[PDB]
Structures are given as structure tokens and as C-alpha cells.
Amino acid sequence: PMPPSEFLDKLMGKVSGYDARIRPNFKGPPVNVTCNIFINSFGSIAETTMDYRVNIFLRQQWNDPRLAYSEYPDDSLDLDPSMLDSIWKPDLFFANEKGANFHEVTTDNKLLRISKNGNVLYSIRITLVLACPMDLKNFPMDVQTCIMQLESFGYTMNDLIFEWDEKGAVQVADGLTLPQFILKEEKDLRYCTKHYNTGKFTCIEARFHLERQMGYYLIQMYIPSLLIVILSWVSFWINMDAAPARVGLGITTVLTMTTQSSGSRASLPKVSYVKAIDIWMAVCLLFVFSALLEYAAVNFIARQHEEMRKLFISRAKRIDTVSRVAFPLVFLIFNIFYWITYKII
Amino acid sequence: PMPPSEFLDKLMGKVSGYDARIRPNFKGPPVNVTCNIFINSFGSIAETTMDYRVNIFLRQQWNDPRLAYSEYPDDSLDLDPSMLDSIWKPDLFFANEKGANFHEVTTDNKLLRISKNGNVLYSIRITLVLACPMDLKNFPMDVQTCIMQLESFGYTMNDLIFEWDEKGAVQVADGLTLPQFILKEEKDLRYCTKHYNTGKFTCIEARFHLERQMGYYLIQMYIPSLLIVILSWVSFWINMDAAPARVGLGITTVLTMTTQSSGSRASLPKVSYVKAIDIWMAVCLLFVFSALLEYAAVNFIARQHEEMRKLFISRAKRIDTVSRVAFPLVFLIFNIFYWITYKII
Amino acid sequence: PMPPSEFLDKLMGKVSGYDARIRPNFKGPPVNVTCNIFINSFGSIAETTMDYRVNIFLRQQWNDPRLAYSEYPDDSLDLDPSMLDSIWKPDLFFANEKGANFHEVTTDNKLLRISKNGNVLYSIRITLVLACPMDLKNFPMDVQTCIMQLESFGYTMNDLIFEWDEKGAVQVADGLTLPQFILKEEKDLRYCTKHYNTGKFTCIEARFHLERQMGYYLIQMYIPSLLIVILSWVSFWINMDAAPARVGLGITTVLTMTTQSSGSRASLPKVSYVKAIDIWMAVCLLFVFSALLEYAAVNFIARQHEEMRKLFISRAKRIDTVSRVAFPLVFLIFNIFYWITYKII
Amino acid sequence: PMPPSEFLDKLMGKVSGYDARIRPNFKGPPVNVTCNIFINSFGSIAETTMDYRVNIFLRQQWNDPRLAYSEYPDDSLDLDPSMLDSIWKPDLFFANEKGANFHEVTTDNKLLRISKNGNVLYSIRITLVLACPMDLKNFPMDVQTCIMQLESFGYTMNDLIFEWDEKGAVQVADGLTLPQFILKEEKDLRYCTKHYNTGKFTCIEARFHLERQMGYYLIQMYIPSLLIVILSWVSFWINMDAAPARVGLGITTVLTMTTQSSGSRASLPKVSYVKAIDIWMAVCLLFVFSALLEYAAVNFIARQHEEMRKLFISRAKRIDTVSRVAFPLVFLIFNIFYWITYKII
Amino acid sequence: PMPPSEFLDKLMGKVSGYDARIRPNFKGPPVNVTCNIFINSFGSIAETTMDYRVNIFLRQQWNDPRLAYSEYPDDSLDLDPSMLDSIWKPDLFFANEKGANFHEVTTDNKLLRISKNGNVLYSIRITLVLACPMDLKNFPMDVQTCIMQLESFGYTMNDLIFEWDEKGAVQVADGLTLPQFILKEEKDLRYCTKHYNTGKFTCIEARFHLERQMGYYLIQMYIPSLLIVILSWVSFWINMDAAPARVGLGITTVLTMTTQSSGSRASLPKVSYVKAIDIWMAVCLLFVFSALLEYAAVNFIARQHEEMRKLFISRAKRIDTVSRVAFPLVFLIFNIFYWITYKII
Ligand SMILES: *[C@@H]1O[C@H](CO)[C@@H](O[C@@H]2O[C@H](CO)[C@@H](O)[C@H](O)[C@H]2NC(C)=O)[C@H](O)[C@H]1NC(C)=O
Ligand SMILES: *[C@@H]1O[C@H](CO)[C@@H](O[C@@H]2O[C@H](CO)[C@@H](O)[C@H](O)[C@H]2NC(C)=O)[C@H](O)[C@H]1NC(C)=O
Numbered sequence A, B, C, D, E: 001p002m003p004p005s006e007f008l009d010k011l012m013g014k015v016s017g018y019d020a021r022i023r024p025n026f027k028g029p030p031v032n033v034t035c036n037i038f039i040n041s042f043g044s045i046a047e048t049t050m051d052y053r054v055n056i057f058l059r060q061q062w063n064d065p066r067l068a069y070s071e072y073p074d075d076s077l078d079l080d081p082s083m084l085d086s087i088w089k090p091d092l093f094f095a096n097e098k099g100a101n102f103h104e105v106t107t108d109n110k111l112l113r114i115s116k117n118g119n120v121l122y123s124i125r126i127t128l129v130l131a132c133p134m135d136l137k138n139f140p141m142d143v144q145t146c147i148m149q150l151e152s153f154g155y156t157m158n159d160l161i162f163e164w165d166e167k168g169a170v171q172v173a174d175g176l177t178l179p180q181f182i183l184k185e186e187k188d189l190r191y192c193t194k195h196y197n198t199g200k201f202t203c204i205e206a207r208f209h210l211e212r213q214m215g216y217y218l219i220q221m222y223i224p225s226l227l228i229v230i231l232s233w234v235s236f237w238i239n240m241d242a243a244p245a246r247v248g249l250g251i252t253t254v255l256t257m258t259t260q261s262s263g264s265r266a267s268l269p270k271v272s273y274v275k276a277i278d279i280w281m282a283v284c285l286l287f288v289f290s291a292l293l294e295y296a297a298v299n300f301i302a303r304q305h306e307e308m309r310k311l312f313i314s315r316a317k318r319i320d321t322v323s324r325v326a327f328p329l330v331f332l333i334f335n336i337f338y339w340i341t342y343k344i345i
């Protein structure tokens, strides 16, 4: 019979009185909007800005009894996105947008379908710049959790209620990678139900668990700083009398410990509180620092003054042979207490 | 009875003569607009640009006797954001915007309610890029104060007056963090009342006190530069005669003091005036610098010329044993006078 | 006769009933849209963001029997881009846009031609910010593959079908360069045919193979780190007794191995998993590290204690003459196993 | 009587024939538009891009005899910014915009007042990204001058003439700071009067003098590089025979002179011509370079060959005692000629 | 008589049938559009993105016999930019835009004049982000050529033809500087005449020759790396027996050669192929590398074993006195062959 574009103008026009500024079931029960998203892209998790951008589909389903039809034979319709302003749509927004936009390439990326009984499917495509607060206390060994919450804006709880559908509430695209994190397959789903001095506004959220990878920070920041500490211990096996050899090994080890730490401030984030990589790069500075102060003691005792010249030279060898075993044992005690308290947490 | 969207077109149309270009109470008392904000997001406090961005709600309440109604039974209404251009709204703007924008995702994030007596509630959602001038004289030990002021633009003092409401004038969202600062729970509220050659324009402002965290700059910039100064003092306990050991300890300590300072210019801001971290990294350069000039004196006196060869070698040991105690005492006097004058301020 | 702009208003107006919201061949066979692109610009392949931008022409051809004409004499027409909203156009979009826009400089860069039988040519100009996931396991020796896929949005498989034309489906502009990659002349063309819970949506894609150039990373990151390992081997030819000469060569070689690696973290990407350049810069750290621990053994055996003073000094020369040949042989075995497993892959 | 919004529609409508596309005083004298600006924000003076952004008010005053009224009683009016397109406005633009925009937060930030005799006040709020060419020949000791010029675009000299008003032509906001510069209170005001092949177009400009602060570059780039040169002179007081002590002091001083210069390339701008900080960091490299070549002469003469073994060892001490006094005297002559020629200019 | 705005509505209205969608001289000769540009700003030549932005005026002149008038007395008119959509304008675009925009500050920056015979002048103001491929083979000694080409989009060769006018086709603003390049006063002008599978589209282009300045790269990258090579040669004048002095001079010279190269990777571009600065910083690494391997030979021959102890100590002095003259002669041969092949090219 008549084409669907003319059939919807009969259904939504000034005939039949469909006003797009009044929600369905007016002065009655609230509207049960159900939602599910589909994540196309995900990433660029900035940590100075503390945000991440995501590229989603947003599928919304509700019921509208004013749009029920029976004369037209086909079981479903589709409104063109040009005529989309003549339909009541929920005023969904994201409570932590921090900037967002649509996509308008070659067509508005907006889909609208109307079933026969009046169920309405509405699917759009959004780029979000969502903000999640991050906790970089233990920086390589951290688990970040970045939420994504969907409030209503104008309609309160008694007029409009969001729901996650019980059939795949969050799907993720297949070949999706990240430069630093991995995305677990555990999506929490819970209500939040914001209160203001304006009213009870509904909101639903979805939590994403992010686990930071490790293999880069071991190879270039832990293991090289580990080897600089090992090169401090070889002063305790070099002779006592070789005075240019000991202190030439001394400061040039604390120089390369500073050079290791100074160049690595570009790759690390720029927060103003102490990390767990920063405790490692500061305690490993102290062992190189304490490995020279040992020799400042040995050089002073051996130079100190025949019977007494043999007694002091035997006491200075005693503090050497103690420090060969006892001081690498101290570093292993730190190395145990470090990795326990940053894998339990 | 009739739906609220048709009731507002009777109330705002060409019938009843409501013109949206004339403020309420025209040729009479001024309009008492009262305001309060709600901060969703806050951060990215750039210091090269000297600004910070914030994501707020902006609630405005005023009275409009032309919008008073009694026939419609419900105690409140809500205008749809499409029909929002047919209401007088105040021309509020921020005196230090430096760029801003709305959010138009899935609906204009704009709320309008009309009470029965004519009170109007208007709530929108704005991202600001507000500018605050910063004073980095004492850089780690600083308290920044970044204002947020709300002028009127077209209406003068006798027509429109802003007010902070006496019931929660600034609320902040709960789980809100910052990468470098902490946000105190002390919001000042004061008038500013701008004058121009155009007229008296009202404005209200809200001050935010920011306190910079400390723990990163201690662990990687103060304490490592502190340990380099301690490694200068061990030259005074090494023997006088070990000439490659003293100067090999000398310059390699002033090399790692430069290497500590040179790599840290990326994390620091790029202002062109002297900070308090810059005084520390320059005075601690002088103690490493002065620890070698001591040895340049000792090597010259001991080489200088039997009776006189014993007298000079005893004078050069005198200037060593003085400098073992007196020069670390000088550094503690600087270390007292530094931290006093940057914690009193 | 009559001008073509007035002839198209007769063809597309309310006369003849051409509605731009109904696809051609409605309630019949699907529409066979055929496509080919023309790449003007290409590049800025970011790897933190994992995307690349491209500037294309997008030529679309389909058939529309409602636009067939015979009265007007000329064999082709051209609709002005102002009147472009009165033509059914396919809702093509890119499945990995991540932001895109048109160009509207001096005229909308949009072309539309209508042939006599009803074939329609439609050519536009788009800047894309397409996203491709990258795999930086073997970072200098990698072959990246960045796809470009073109879904439909609103119309399912039974209504609209995309095709690559069989005559030059992807052309590339002539003098097109890249800062880091080279673009092979092998463009794959395959279907993808997306499924959702909404329906079967057609999509076609084109793969681009990118091969990273090598010559920068050899000259400044492999060859200089190669020469630092060679400067470790000259300690095995310097005398055993020259104790300041050996360890002064020792740590100052592991200092310049760290200095080589620390400054190169700015040019490298910032992923959080181990690369192939990172294995090279860590194993070459171990050979410089192991070249000093050899001397810590030699200095301890030779100092260890006449008959036994000759036996130990001959054993310490034995471990030197073994390490002159055997340890550069170990490095060549690593140097073989490295370049084999990163050129086979 | 009647409200001012309806009185202006009588004044600007199709009644009385006010056409907004014809300037006042048509086919007569030119229009004397007078202007003054008010700088709210100022800064982010980039030097790679060679631009600076500024946030101004722009007040324009002209006369329009068609807008003169006498029936309405009040002495001034105000047109709403929605109805602003029905007024002739000058086509002022900035000759070095390089991008700019308005502000449209909560209302267009646009003001229009009409006096009784026909004087029109028009005030808007603009963010500019104005471009000024910079001359970094003498980089810390420079005085930058960044202009701000306001051409007309369509109207020539005989139709429209800009003027600075004689009452506060440029005001600046009170608490306005900059990260690197200071803004002098000397605003030049002069005409520029652009010619083209199109016609004489009027323009007025305002010069701003910027003076770069100094205190950061002294503390971290001049004074530390000054101390490295002083540590070269202590080789001339260390003994001649201590051969590892002299060259160990030699290269480790030219290493820390390179380390000082290499890390400072991030803070400096990236121009491709020689600065004044670059002459300092290159000449101070030569004094450390020449302080070792002195010892290469001393070590060769003293090793050169009893009577002649005493003569050469007395000649090598002669070139030492000359270089103790004469070479720090040469550096002071450079230090005089440097600071004179970069403070006169 | 009647004002010009009403005279153009008679000339362009539905009276006289001027349709703005049909080019002048329809079904006849093509339109001879002539063009010339005026460059206001120029710069920010990025090399990672391989583009540059420019701020131009764009003057277009063509003839339109439908706009010829004789009744109105004045010899020229000017259409207001609001009524600008009622004029046929050429669909000029730039073939390498990569993003562009107009300027709409206080008025659309668009000019239109109509002469009496029908010549039309049209001048607009555009910011371009034009893309030019760059060839950084010889990086400091390069001459870049960045084109600027102006295609037609919809009209083919037989309908519209672009021309450069024979009277000043490209003017440049007077005080125009660049941070790294200089702009020669030699503007090439040639046709390009693009072909597609769509048709012959006209295009004209203008080449700009850019010559990179040199003075920064000499003072801080060539001359300092030159002096490090000179400090290698002083080992050949220091005594053979001073074993800590030679290798302490050895590695600390190859450390500062790496430190010179490592810090300079931030200022250099990030291409992935070998430059000419990279050949210099790698060959100058080899001379410092080869200056130590000489001493590894000398220390091994002199230690090798009375008659034979005199013969080897005289052979090791022979290889020293050869290397004092012969090896700085080798570096000058490289220094000749380097600067010849990078100034001929
Ligand atoms: C939307 O969902 C809510 C809850 O799922 C429904 O509200 C309840 O509906 C049942 C039967 O109509 C009543 O027994 C309850 O009293 C209602 N309230 C609550 C709090 O449970 C509501 O009917 C649904 N509305 C529509 C249009 O489906
Ligand atoms: C808006 O607030 C101001 C001050 O709160 C009111 O102005 C005063 O109103 C009282 C009584 O009407 C007078 O006694 C005063 O003379 C007024 N002026 C001042 C400076 O105090 C004003 O009435 C309020 N307007 C509305 C509509 O509420």
C-alpha cells in the first residue's frame, strides 16, 4: 500500500495528536527504558588528565503505546534520521562525560525502529571522553577500575527508570587491544540512583577492571637498577689498599644509579605522591650510597695507627668480611618485604 | 485536562503577550537571581597555560510573575529544551572563561521547571576552561587559590543581581581526586561587583584553595640531592696522599649533582623566575663545588715546601680536621634556614 | 531547452512523488552499491593512540530507477550540492571511525551525477582518524596491518549490499611518503559481514600492509650499543695488576650502556610489554655487567695466597685467556639467535 | 508605554525602511567608528608556533542617524542579541587572527545599546590566537614586541574609518600575570592603513612590549656552567706528576659541561639559528676543552728529555704558573665582552 | 536612486531568472576563473605530521554576463556576505587540504564586488593545514619544496578553467619570519591538470622553496662532537706507562660522545631512516671508539716479553708515533668527503 515514510507522518503528525514533548504513559507508571552498549574502540587512558576515551553503540528500548499500529502490514518500520525529532526520546546522558560528540559521516549514525505493538529500538554511535579517578599508589602493580554511568537528566525516578537488559548488557568488540592495560572479561552491573536537591534521578553503571601489564617495567627499570646494586658488592672483594679502584667504583655506581632514575622520569606519570616504583628507585639508591660509606670506614680505620698497625689492619678486614655476607643479606630482606606487600595488595 | 506542553504554549505564546526579550519586573525592582553550582569533575590544572578545567552543573533560580498560573492543577511544570528559547533567561557568563561549551549528547543537557507561583529553576551542564593566575615562588611548598567568578553581561546592577543561596552554595562530587593537588573543604564566597565605563555589572565568586602534595618531590628530588652532598664529605676522611681518589670522588660527585638537576627539568614547570626547588638544587651544587676547592687547597699546601716539610704537612691536616666538622655544620644551618622560611610562608 | 536545475526539481519534487526517505527497488531486491576510494593523504600513525589518519575520496555508484529520464537531451546531469538532501543516499559509515569530518572550503566537497538510465555517481571527500590495533612485540622488525572497513548502519543485508568494483578498487596518490613506514602495493579486499542482535549488516574492508623502515634504529641504537660491548672486551687485554685501569674501564662502560638506554626512551613507544629492542638493550647490559664480575674474580684469586703465590697467579691468567676467546664467542651465539628469530617472524 | 523590544521592531522593520545592508551616511562622508579594547586574559606565548592568545572585550562606537528616536521616553535602549542581525555592524577583523572564536555560554556574549541621538555602543567578547613574529637572537636578554591590528575587510577608506578613542584606548585587567614575560604599561597606538590591489583599507594597531624575566636562566644555566669552568682551573694547582688526577679531572669536567648543555635543550626553544645562551654554552665548552690541552702540553714537555731533565721540568712549571693567572684573565675578558653586548642591545 | 541592496535583489531574484546553480556561459565556452593569493601568515612546519599551516587571502575573478547592468549609475557594487548564496561561485578547493576553515569573527570574512560589465571579484580568508611530503635524507643541509595546488571539484575541464593572473600571482606579507626555515623569493607557477576516472579536472599550483638554517646545528651538534674527537687524540701524547690515565681518558671520552648524542634525540625529528646528522654522530663515535683500541694494542705489546724487552717497547712507541699523525689525517679525509657530498647535493 502506502510507503512507510508517509505512514509515519500520519502516525506522528498533527493528526492523532502525537506530541513529542510528552513521555508515554503520562500521569501513570514510569517508563521502563532498557539499555545495552557495544564497545567498538577503547583506550588512550591518560593519567595526567585521568580519563579514557571509548567509542560505543548505545541501544535503547522502551514502549510507547501511541506508536502502536495495526493497519500497515509489515511487522516493523524504520524512521529516517531526518524525521527523528518527532519522537519522544529519553534524555540519557553520562554522568562523567568530560566532553563527547556524535558522528555525522555520510548520514547521522542514528537508528530507529518501531515494532507493531509499540516497542521502539533506538541505536546511536557516540565517542565519549569519560573520566575515571585513578589511584597510582602502587604503580606497576595496580588494578584500575573505571566506571561508566548513565543518568537521566530531566525526568526523575517516578517518570523514567533505566535498566540493564538481561541478555548481554555489555558486549565488547573482538580484536581489541590496549598499549598498557588488559581488559578483564568481568563487567559489574549495578545501580547508583543519584540524589540531588532537585530530585531522585535514576542511573545505571558498568564497571571495567583494568590490569596493568608488567613486562616493560621489569626489563628496563627493575632489573637494570637491580644490577647496579650488584656492582656495588664487588668493591668488597677488591683489595683494601687499591684506593683509586674502590672509590672509582663507588661514585660511578651512584652516578649510574642516578642516571637510571633521571632518564626514567619521562616514561613515568607525573603525580605528586610516592609510587611503588619510586620506593624501589630510592631504596636501591641507599644501598649504593651505603656501599661507599663502608669504604670510608675501612679507609679511615686502616690509615689509623708495630703492634697497633697490625691490630687495626685486622679489624678493617673484619668489617669487610662481615659486609660481604651481611649486607647482601639485608638487600634480600628488603627484596622479600617489597614483593610481598605489592602482590598481596 | 490539557497536556503541559500545550498549556505552556498558551502561557508563552502571542496570546498573553509574554515577550522573552523583556526581563520580569520591568521598570521596577531588579531581578534577584540566586545561584549554586555542583562540581562533577575538576582537574588538569595546567601551569604553562595557567588554567584548569571544571565540569559543573549550574542551577539558577529567579521569579517571573508573568509565568504564574492557577488553572492547571499540578504544582510544577517542566519546559522541554526544544521550546527553551521562549523564556527570559539571565545572561550569566564567567569572567575568566578562556573557552567553554555545553553538552548536547542525546538531548541538550538543560533543565527548566516552573513552579505555580512563578519561581523558575534552570539547570545546565557546562565544561569550563577557567583561568587562574598562579604564583610559583615557593614551588613544592605552595598554596594555590583559583577563583571562579560569574558576571552578568548585558544587564547592569539596577536590573539584575546575582546571589549565592544560603543553602549549600557549592557542592562537590564525592570521589574526586587530583594528580598533584588536594582540594580543601573551605569555599569562600564573596562579591566582586565589576565596574567599567559601561556600568556597574554584578558578579559573585567562589574561591578554591589548593594545597600541593609533597611526597614525590622529597623522594626523588630532595633526598637524592641530599645524599650527593653526603658523598662529598667522605673525601675529608680519605687520606691526603691518595690524589686520584680525592679528585675522582670530587668531579664525579659534581657530575651526578648536575645529572640529578638536568634530568629533573622535564618534570618541573617552565617559568622564568626562581623557585624554591631551584634554590635547593643550586645551593647543594655549591657544597659539592666547595668540597673540591678544599682539596685544591690541601694538595697545594702539602706539595708546598726537613723542618718546613713537617710544618706544612701538619697545617694541611689542620684544615682537613676543621673541615670535617665545620662544613657539615654549615650545611645544617642552611638546612634549618631553608625549611623555616618555606613553612612559615 | 530548460536548464538542468529546473529539470531536476521536476524530477525530484512533489510532482512524480520521489521521496528521498525510501530506497530504490523498495520491497524487492536489495540495492547493489559499489564503491572505490582514492587516498590523497596518509600518515601520522600514532602508536600511543593506536590510530592513523587518512584523507580519501569516496566514490559510490548505485542504480535508482526513479531517476531515469528520457526527455532531456544530454546524457548526464549534475545535482548541485545545495539540493543534495533530495536524493536517497546510502548510510555508509566506517566501523572504526574514531572521529571524522567533511571539508566545506569554498563549497561542500560533494559531487553528484545522474546518468540517463538512472545510474548515480556520488563522490565526497573525508578526513578519517581510523583506528588499527598494533602489535609491537618485535618493534623494529614488524609488519603492521591496518584495516579500513565500511559498514552500513541502518539498512540490513536484504536491503543494501556493498561491493568493491572490479576496476581499480583502491587507488593511491603518486608522491605519497611516510616518516617511519613504507606502504606496500598489495591491497587485500574481503568481506566481513557484521552480525549483531539487530541484524546482518553488510561491510567491505581493505587491508593495508605497512613495513617499518630500519636504518635509523641500526645507526643509533644497535651499532652504538654494539660498540659498548666491544669496549668491555679490552679489559681482558689490559694487565692484571693495573687495578684502577680495569674497574675504571668497567663501570664507565656500564654507565655509558645505561646512558645509551636511558636517553632512547623518548624515541621509543610507551607500551607496557617487552619489545625486541628491549631484549637487545637488556642482554647487552648483561655482557657489560658480566665483564666486570670476571675481574672481581681475577682480582680476588690473584690477591689470594713462595710456591702458592705462583700457582694462583697462573690460575688467574688462565681464567683471563679463556675469557678472551670464550666470552666473545658467547655474544656471537646470542647475535645469531637474535637476528634469526626476528627475521623469520 | 510600549516595551522597548516592540519599539525597536518599529524602528528596524519593513516600516521606516531600515536596511541592515547599507551603512549609515550612505553616499556621503565615511563612518567614524571608534574603538577600545579590554584585555581579560593574556598569555601562552608559544615560540615554536610564534603566537599568543588573548581574551578581550571589543567596544565599538559609531553614529547611525537612521536609529535616532524621540518618541520613546528613556534615554537609552538595548537590543537583545537574538535580534542583532537587523543592525548595520562594521566588518572589523584582526589582520593576524590565526584562528579566533566568540563565546556562547548561556547567552551570546554580545551587547548592543542605542542612545537617543543615534550613537550605538557594541561590545563583544573574543578569544584571539594572534600571531607575532619573534626575534630570538639574544634569547634571555630580549624585548619582544607583539602587535594587535584591526583592519576593515569590505569597506575601503572612503566608507569606513577606525579610530582609537581619546579616553583609555587599551585597558588591562588588574591581576594579570605571565609565566615567562612581564607586560610593560606602555601601549603604543598608531595607524597602519593597508594597501592592496583592491583598495585602501583602514587599520589601527596597538603594540605591546614584553620583557623576558631572567632569574631562572641565571640560577640553572649560567651559574652552573660558570662553576664547571672554575673546576677546570684547579688542575693548575694539582701536582704535575699526578697523571691520573689531572686527566680524571679533565674529561669529567668536559663530560659535565656536555651533560649541563644536553639536558637543557628541552627547556630552550627549537629555533635553527644561534642564540645568546648558545654562545655562552659553546664558549664555556672551549675553556674546559682548552684546560686539558694545557695538560697535554705539560705532560709532553715534562716527559721529554742530567742537565736537560732539569731544564724541561722547569719549563713545564713555567707554562703552568703562566696559565694559573693568564687563562682566568682571558675568561674575564670574555665575561666582560659578553654582558656588555647583551645589555646595550 | 534606489539603494544597491534592493538593486541586486532585482538583479538576482526570481525576476530575470538568475539561477545560482547554473554557471555562466552555459552550454558554451568554459569559465576562465583567474586567481591570486596573498599569504598573511606561514609556518609551524611540522615534520612528524609532514604539513604546514598557512593563512591566505584568496582572490577570484571571473566573468558573468547575467550580472551585467547599465541602469544603476555607479561603476561598481558590493554584495553583502549574508546574501552571498545567490551568486554562482566556483567550487575551488585545495588538493592537499588536510583540514581547513574560514574565519567568522564579527562578520564573515568574505568580499564580493560586481563591476558594470559583469566582472566579479570574490575574496575570502582561509586557514589551511596543507600537507607537503618532506625528504629528510640530508637533514641540516636540505632544501624543502612544499606545493600548494588548487583543483576544481565538480566542474570538469570543458566547463571551468583556473588561471594564475599575469599581475602578481602570489604576494607575501612583509615582516614574515620562520623558526627554522627561510622562504626564498622564487615562486614557481605551473599547471597540473588532474585526471581521474571521473574526468579531467583543472588545477594550478604554486611551489615554495624552503631552505633550512644552519647556525644552531653547528654550534651545538657538530662543533661539540668535533671537540670530543680532538680530546681523543691527547691520549697519544700522554705517556705509555700511565695506564689509569689513558683508559680513564678513553671511556670517559666515549661516554661524553654518547651523552652528546643521547640528549640530542629530542631536538631531532623522529623519522626511521638515516639522516646526515646521524652519519656524523655515528662516524665520530667510531674515532673515539678506535682511539681506545689503539691503546689496547699498545698496552698488550708493551706488556709482552733483556733484549726483547727493549725491542717490544720500541715497537709500541712506533705504533704511537704513527697514530699521532696518521689517524688525525684519516679524520680530515672523512671531514672533506662529508662536507663535499652534502653541499653539492
Ligand atoms: C515499569 O517497571 C516497574 C517495575 O518493574 C512497574 O511498576 C510496578 O508495576 C506493578 C504492576 O503494574 C505494580 O504491582 C507495582 O506496584 C509497580 N511499582 C513497583 C515499585 O514495583 C511498572 O508497571 C512498569 N511500567 C511499564 C509501562 O511497564
Ligand atoms: C531583590 O532584592 C533587593 C534587595 O534584597 C530588593 O530591593 C529592596 O527591596 C526592599 C523592599 O522591597 C526595599 O525596602 C529596598 O529599598 C530595596 N532596595 C535595597 C538596596 O535594599 C528587591 O525588592 C528585590 N526584588 C524582588 C523582585 O524581589
Ligand SMILES: *[C@@H]1O[C@H](CO)[C@@H](O[C@@H]2O[C@H](CO)[C@@H](O)[C@H](O)[C@H]2NC(C)=O)[C@H](O)[C@H]1NC(C)=O
Pocket: C025, C029, C030, C031, C032
Ligand atoms: C543485486 O545483486 C544481487 C546479487 O548479485 C542480485 O540478487 C540476485 O539476482 C538474480 C537475478 O535477479 C537472482 O537469480 C538471485 O536469486 C538473486 N539473489 C542472490 C543471493 O544471488 C540482485 O538482483 C541485484 N539487485 C539489483 C537491483 O541489481
Ligand SMILES: *[C@@H]1O[C@H](CO)[C@@H](O[C@@H]2O[C@H](CO)[C@@H](O)[C@H](O)[C@H]2NC(C)=O)[C@H](O)[C@H]1NC(C)=O
Pocket: D025, D029, D030, D031, D032
Ligand atoms: C568622520 O571624520 C572625518 C575626519 O575626522 C570627517 O571628514 C571631514 O569632515 C569635515 C567637516 O565635515 C570636512 O571639513 C573635511 O573635509 C572632511 N574630510 C577630511 C579628510 O578631513 C567626517 O565628516 C566625519 N564623518 C562623520 C559622519 O562624522
Ligand SMILES: *[C@@H]1O[C@H](CO)[C@@H](O[C@@H]2O[C@H](CO)[C@@H](O)[C@H](O)[C@H]2NC(C)=O)[C@H](O)[C@H]1NC(C)=O
Pocket: E025, E029, E030, E031, E032
Ligand atoms: C576562456 O579562455 C579560453 C582560452 O583562453 C577560450 O577558448 C578559446 O577561445 C577562442 C576564441 O573564442 C577560440 O578561438 C578557441 O578555439 C577557444 N579554445 C581554445 C582551446 O583555445 C575561451 O573562449 C574563453 N572563454 C571566455 C568566456 O572567455
